Amino acid sequence: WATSEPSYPSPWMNPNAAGWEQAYQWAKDFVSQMTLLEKVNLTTGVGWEGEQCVGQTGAIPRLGLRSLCLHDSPLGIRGTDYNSAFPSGQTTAATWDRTLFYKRGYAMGKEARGKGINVLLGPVAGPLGRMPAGGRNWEGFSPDPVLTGIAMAETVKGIQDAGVIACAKHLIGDEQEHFRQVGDGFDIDESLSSNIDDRTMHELYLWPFADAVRAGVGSVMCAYNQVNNSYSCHNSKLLNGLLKNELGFQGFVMSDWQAQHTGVASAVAGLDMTMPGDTVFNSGLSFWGANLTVAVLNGTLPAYRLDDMAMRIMAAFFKVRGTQDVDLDPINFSFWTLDTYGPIHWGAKEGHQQINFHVDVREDHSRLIREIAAKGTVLLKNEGALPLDKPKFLAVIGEDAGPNHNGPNSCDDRGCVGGTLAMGWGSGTANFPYLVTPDAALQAQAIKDGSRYESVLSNHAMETIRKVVSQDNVTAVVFVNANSGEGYITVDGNRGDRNNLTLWNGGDELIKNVASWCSNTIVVIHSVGPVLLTDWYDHPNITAILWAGLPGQESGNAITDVLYGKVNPAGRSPFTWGATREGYGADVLYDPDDARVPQQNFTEGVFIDYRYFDKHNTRVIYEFGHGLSYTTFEYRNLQIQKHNVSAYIPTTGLTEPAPTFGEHSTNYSDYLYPEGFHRANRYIYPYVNSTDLELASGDPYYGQTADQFLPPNATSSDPQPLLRSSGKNSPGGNPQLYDVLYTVTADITNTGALEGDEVVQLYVSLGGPDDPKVMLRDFARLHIKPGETVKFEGKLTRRDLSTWDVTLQDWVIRDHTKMVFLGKSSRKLVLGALLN
Ligand SMILES: *[C@@H]1O[C@H](CO)[C@@H](O[C@@H]2O[C@H](CO)[C@@H](O[C@@H]3O[C@H](CO)[C@@H](O)[C@H](O[C@H]4O[C@H](CO)[C@@H](O)[C@H](O)[C@@H]4O)[C@@H]3O)[C@H](O)[C@H]2NC(C)=O)[C@H](O)[C@H]1NC(C)=O
Ligand SMILES: *[C@@H]1O[C@H](CO)[C@@H](O[C@@H]2O[C@H](CO)[C@@H](O[C@@H]3O[C@H](CO)[C@@H](O)[C@H](O)[C@@H]3O)[C@H](O)[C@H]2NC(C)=O)[C@H](O)[C@H]1NC(C)=O
Ligand SMILES: *[C@@H]1O[C@H](CO)[C@@H](O[C@@H]2O[C@H](CO)[C@@H](O[C@@H]3O[C@H](CO)[C@@H](O)[C@H](O)[C@@H]3O)[C@H](O)[C@H]2NC(C)=O)[C@H](O)[C@H]1NC(C)=O
Ligand SMILES: *[C@@H]1O[C@H](CO)[C@@H](O[C@@H]2O[C@H](CO)[C@@H](O[C@@H]3O[C@H](CO)[C@@H](O)[C@H](O)[C@@H]3O)[C@H](O)[C@H]2NC(C)=O)[C@H](O)[C@H]1NC(C)=O
Ligand SMILES: *[C@@H]1O[C@H](CO)[C@@H](O[C@@H]2O[C@H](CO)[C@@H](O)[C@H](O)[C@H]2NC(C)=O)[C@H](O)[C@H]1NC(C)=O
Ligand SMILES: *[C@@H]1O[C@H](CO)[C@@H](O[C@@H]2O[C@H](CO)[C@@H](O)[C@H](O)[C@H]2NC(C)=O)[C@H](O)[C@H]1NC(C)=O
Ligand SMILES: *[C@@H]1O[C@H](CO)[C@@H](O)[C@H](O)[C@H]1NC(C)=O
Ligand SMILES: OC[C@H]1O[C@@H](O)[C@H](O)[C@@H](O)[C@@H]1O
């Protein structure tokens, strides 16, 4: 069995780090004036359903700070009205456009701010996408680390310039939604452990988080799963050794809802804030809260650690926002209802006022949502069918093309299929302000165009369909979908995770039938991820296939732009379209197989998605980074310019000893509930109810000093040595990792008749017997006019060419023959040269 090695003590903030020096100072000037009670309020959630947002902290009224509001989603504001619904992160990734990564972020952030949210619970790098059938991979960006890391840095930078606090979501493992928690139909004693060896962790799953740390993300969420059999929220090597030690993360770490299962041990493991605060939803008891105060008071949790917890939360707050002000606008919505009036303490039915204000907060974001959705559509196949000109008879076919007869928001958290699919289910959702359905957008295009339009919005009226598409001169566009979501909603026996990689609602045989009766058949797929196209992609009557992903509120208008050439395709697949499911290598584990704790050995190593296909030459139908245009592009004249140099010297030194900020009284009666006080039911408070700390806690396991149940040095205050693989005041790793060793340029020439975008992609091969054949390392999206030639330049950093040595515990550049390639895809590599 795998074990998680201990890394202690929990690193405290560096006052000279990166872009936090000022935010550190302002936090220092603020937490210094906090009582122990107030520190426990900022770190402990009020309990599930306790307030307005999906998570809220204790307030600090004496210092003028209201409760902090934390809320979903990574694609728009969840559970409220007059928000926008942006396209998924997966689809956004498919644009391969950093500008759009950022614009979507700043967009989402501005809406969260307008509602009064202080922490937006996004963007997502866990799951990265280890298995195509994973329930939530669509919330992320790509199974590929470089594209995902770029998308994260850019989305985080957007969210926070708005500016609310961004949250790098689900720290590592959690590539699957089965067994993420316990119970729920299965007999497992603990959550699944995904076990990841050290090299895999550094150059695959942690890679994007590094990028989020280096971009300045204010918070990080730990995940429900264990890693080497200790929950990510109790994990020393992960939270202390990797995130806060090596990458030097300066912000605060919050828990996934009910992901914390221990109090003090979790605090020194690295957890700064527990959410929504209970031990368990509606239980009224906390592993922190009252337990947190008696932990300091009885000596076993060092004072410096709770000050660090406070320092991190308040530093994040001050890093965004950018003024020393606290003092926020009111939280103007409520998550638990849409009613205008209701209990502000929803769970307890206490505090009946106006909790919903219906603030339009939408701006003109529909322009951006429609642009991203179109520029993120992938044109998979095009045998002379597209763009559509003025078809005499256009016939749209499929349920996915129509309205949910029950309305766009009929199902809470999007937990059902019906009509068009524009969004997966789970927390990663928002309500649509409207949902432009393809039927309506295409019909209106055809009418303006003078065409004849008929639609059959069913997957099963077969003879009805036949009569429609058999007629002379028919252009048939057929809409099919596949879905997944978070594990707490089962839609048609899919327990969050996809059961299989085929289309839902019999889309396969719907396509096979339409292609059977019509010679110009176009397939559009709305889906959470790849679907096996094997039985029908090469049909001679299917003349084009497009993947439009999860486009959000403007899905209809976006696919019309692409079909009629208003927007020229360019979108590249953020994943591989394989022929079998075994061809992807790793797979979801749907059954614990009598095991008490399901174990997931990540023995595929760094070989997920296209890396796996390329290594074992399993069959690929559309490769990673594939996408077509209505024009053509000629790559010529490769140039690699090598910068000298600067030797990679280690890092190096010794930190400052753990500080204290403010003081705490030792008169236990100071922490009793104030005399008049009224306890909202099940609300999580910081006050003790007995001057007997053992009784105050009510923990039946009470009474051991830190040396009896915490590992060595777990509370140590002494200066700690600096890790070889970090930078001194440089969060993200040894800053020489990001020196540019090579500049790579080619000449990209549009050779078609229509203007368009091109997604030049940069791949490297690091020699190496255990290495992939190609790894993506840079990319660029260029706009080129028909006659034009354009200079693409890419960069390769010292990290870009490195392997993680575990003996050395750093990054090295081994002495293997190494090469760089430029391609139109993972496989369509047209230029290559030796890196000298
Ligand atoms: C000071 O106050 C704090 C706050 O309440 C109080 O903390 C609690 O401490 C106990 C230790 O006494 C913690 O409980 C243990 O937790 C660890 C990690 O989860 C377990 O390994 C421990 O196992 C013991 O007993 C088991 C049963 O035989 C064995 O299997 C095991 O090997 C161990 O012997 C035990 O479960 C508890 O988590 C915290 N509570 C919170 C909310 O943090 C502390 O005890 C007080 N200190 C003093 C000196 O009074
Ligand atoms: C999950 O477990 C794996 C393996 O138990 C952890 O990976 C291992 O990480 C340690 C460092 O944390 C590596 O240690 C080094 O060992 C070399 C000898 O090979 C030694 O010379 C060095 O001094 C160094 O200590 C270890 O090699 C590595 N093992 C593998 C197979 O990669 C992993 O970090 C664990 N993850 C978590 C979150 O606990
Ligand atoms: C820790 O956080 C909690 C929750 O945010 C804080 O509790 C809030 O405290 C105020 C007063 O301290 C309570 O106000 C009272 O309402 C009555 C009428 O019901 C009114 O007469 C009072 O003047 C006051 O407005 C408020 O209800 C309470 N919130 C809850 C949910 O109970 C607490 O103060 C924080 N502790 C510290 C040390 O900052
Ligand atoms: C802190 O703890 C004390 C006791 O540990 C709490 O006080 C007590 O509350 C219980 C009920 O919650 C009272 O007991 C029983 O209550 C019913 C309903 O009133 C009563 O009719 C029965 O005859 C029976 O006594 C108990 O009398 C009461 N004792 C005292 C001294 O208050 C206290 O409420 C807790 N404080 C907070 C802020 O939660
Ligand atoms: C502090 O944490 C402990 C557990 O770490 C909480 O303990 C519960 O106490 C009840 C009392 O009957 C037991 O039945 C449970 O087994 C205990 N553990 C749980 C619920 O996980 C304790 O309530 C916490 N203190 C406060 C004030 O919430
Ligand atoms: C491609 O589409 C055409 C229809 O446009 C299919 O052809 C018809 O085929 C049936 C039986 O094969 C004949 O009875 C009809 O007279 C044909 N009509 C026309 C207009 O050709 C053709 O079979 C389709 N191809 C495939 C592989 O299914
Ligand atoms: C301790 O606190 C209580 C209430 O907060 C107060 O009434 C009492 O006088 C204090 N005692 C000492 C010795 O400070
Ligand atoms: O609902 C709010 C939170 O709790 C859970 O539902 C999800 O796992 C989280 O990702 C989410 O941020």
Author numbering: 32 to 867
Q: Mind quoting what the paper says about this structure?
A:
A linker region (residues 355–394) connects domain 1 to domain 2 and a second linker region (600–662) connects domain 2 to domain 3. The active site is located in a shallow pocket near the interface of the first and second domain. A molecule of β-d-glucose (BGC) was fitted at the active site based on residual electron density observed in electron density Fo–Fc difference maps. The source of the β-d-glucose is most likely the growth medium used as no β-d-glucose was used during crystallizations or soaking. Two catalytic residues were identified, Asp287 (nucleophile) at the N-terminal TIM-barrel domain and Glu517 (acid/base) at the sandwich α/β domain II. Potential glycosylation sites were observed in the CtBGL structure in 10 positions, all in Asn residues. A total of 27 glycan moieties were found in CtBGL. The N-glycan at CtBGL Asn329 was located in domain I of the enzyme and consisted of eight monosaccharides (two GlcNAc, five α-d-Man, and one β-d-Man). CtBGL has been found to be thermostable at 50 °C and to retain half of its activity after incubation at 65 °C for 55 min.
Beta-glucosidases (β-glucosidases) are key cellulolytic enzymes that catalyze the hydrolysis of cellobiose to glucose. They are terminal enzymes of the cellulase system as they act during the final step of the cellulose degradation. They are anomeric configuration-retaining enzymes that operate through the canonical double-displacement glycosidase mechanism, except those of the GH9 family.
